[PDB]
Ligand binder design. Structure first.
Ligand SMILES: *[C@@H]1O[C@H](CO)[C@@H](O)[C@H](O)[C@H]1NC(C)=O
Lengths: 394, 147, 50
């Protein structure tokens, strides 16, 4: 049983591919083997993505795992919908209901808005990056109307990096007109470190400031720098290293040879990579539920040209979708479940705060229970008041 | 398909339209295949070669008009159809010129029950007693709002 | 260490008691805010040194 699948990995996704390989090994069975056809292309380039898709389609694949950018996302969602091809991706969730797309990344929009109310914020700065779509930006802006917030949104993305200093100085110059002390960083693991470094340089990392890293990888970045500064830093973590499941994964991951497995000799793992590993498990359980369900879907490498007109969708694809979307297993990113569209449901996102001793989970966020705080209260706080005795005498 | 079809037919230039979703496809192919693409649609957010845009950039004219009326606090109802290029414009300028902009995506409003949404829309535009609104929409979405 | 604990912001004043003020890296505590003074024996403004 040889199931051929496509793999679209953006140049530079070393740890992601390394995690993709480890998944192939951990979830390899005798019942059937997955044959990944890897294609390293510039994910941003829409044209290239189109070729890589039609190429993997002519090779006759049953499913495709890859990534997309804010620019190429429309290409994938469109083709996969027309050709009834299933596309599994750890990338940011699609802004809508696009069929034949499985998204490993849970929606953070909800967890973010809940955290803001927890700290009871009414006026804050929102530094965003247009890389993962303004889906979360619209979220905070729309909620700013209802909850009545004074949000200062600033696109920290289009900043040219070969002279990006007179821009940051002019950035926190506007964030001083209103004396902004509460900032939300909605950026990638990289753009965050750049900002964090600048923050320390200008000294805006001392007590009084409060930063919120708007990503699923709070511990993915270096925090040792703004850890002793004084400013409170909060964020979100999807990979709970306290789970015996994840703890066991790291035990083998941290030992792997960094030569064969690039950027894999660490005690931690980027949430993007962790989702890639969980993606393999989903594809395995999906193709397995098709064998046990007595469903024939097999074909050959003659699907033909994807530009074929009229384009006829192979009916066997409809079943492959109902398989992946029906999958429900336990992975590094907590309980994995899907709806009819492909968006993850019944998941859990741990809310993190950065203390002196390091990061610490102060609670979690459920799509049905909102935010729920867990034990951690430093009870008490010198509450030991003073007992004053007195007599009733006018 | 329509692009590759017209390309196989051996054309010298292509005139058409694109959406916020298909725009990347056109700009990419036309750049790779060195095919010229003339379009009246919204200008591309960047410098994409082999693309001729008939529509001038309104971003500039809008910002200038705001200062003319001397606006400091206004509501900005936008539609994600023509890209948030102008939205980013007013938001970025809101930092410099110090404006209190209330941006609201009036696009994702489902039209088969779009009434309890408008009532809840001007309910938020009443918390701050917004009297100055900017409608960044198509000729159609504008009439709906105006009505 | 000063930068780490954040004692390099406005309000602090350091004096480097050596003849090599520009000999060390100052780009780090340069934008901090705290005033830093010192001593220089090698004048790079002299045509001789230049
Ligand atoms: C929802 O998720 C929880 C936590 O993983 C799980 O225990 C439960 O079975 C799920 N609910 C259903 C009905 O699938």
């Amino acid at each position: 049983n040889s199931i051929q699948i496509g793999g679209l990995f953006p140049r530079g996704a070393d740890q992601e591919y390394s995690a993709f390989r480890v998944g192939m090994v951990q979830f390899s069975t005798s019942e059937f083997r997955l044959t990944p056809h890897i294609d390293n292309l510039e994910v941003a380039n829409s044209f290239a993505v189109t070729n890589a898709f039609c190429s993997q389609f002519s090779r006759g694949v049953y499913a495709i795992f890859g990534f997309y950018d804010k620019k190429s996302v429309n290409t994938i969602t469109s083709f996969c919908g027309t050709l009834h091809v299933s596309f599994i991706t750890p990338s940011f969730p699609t802004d809508g209901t696009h069929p034949f797309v499985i998204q490993m990344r849970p929606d953070l929009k909800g967890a973010l808005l809940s955290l803001i109310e927890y700290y009871q914020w009414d006026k804050f700065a929102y530094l965003y990056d247009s890389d993962r779509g303004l889906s979360t930006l619209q979220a905070v802006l729309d909620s700013a109307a209802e909850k009545k917030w004074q949000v200062t949104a600033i696109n920290v993305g289009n900043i040219n990096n070969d002279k990006k200093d007179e821009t940051y100085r002019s950035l926190f110059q506007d964030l001083e007109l209103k004396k902004e002390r509460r900032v939300i960083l909605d950026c990638e693991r990289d753009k965050v470190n750049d900002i964090v470094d600048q923050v320390i340089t200008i000294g805006k990392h001392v007590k009084g400031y409060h930063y919120i890293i708007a990503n699923l990888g709070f511990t993915d970045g270096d925090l040792l720098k703004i850890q002793f500064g004084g400013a409170e830093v909060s964020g979100f973590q999807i990979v709970d290293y306290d789970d015996s499941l994840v703890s066991k994964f790291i035990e083998r991951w941290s030992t792997l040879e960094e030569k064969e497995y690039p950027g894999a000799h660490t005690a931690t793992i980027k949430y993007t990579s962790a989702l890639t590993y969980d993606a393999v498990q989903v594809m395995t359980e999906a193709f397995r539920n098709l064998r046990k369900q007595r469903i024939e879907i097999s074909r050959r490498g003659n699907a033909g040209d994807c530009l074929a007109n009229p384009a006829v969708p192979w009916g066997q694809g409809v079943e492959i979708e109902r398989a992946l979307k029906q999958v429900q297993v336990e992975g590094l990113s907590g309980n994995i479940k899907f709806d009819q569209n492909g968006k993850r449901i019944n998941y859990t996102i741990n809310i993190m705060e950065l203390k002196t001793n390091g990061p610490r989970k102060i609670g979690y966020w459920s799509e049905v229970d909102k935010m729920v705080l867990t034990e951690d209260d430093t009870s008490g706080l010198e509450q030991k008041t003073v007992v004053v005795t007195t007599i009733l005498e006018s």
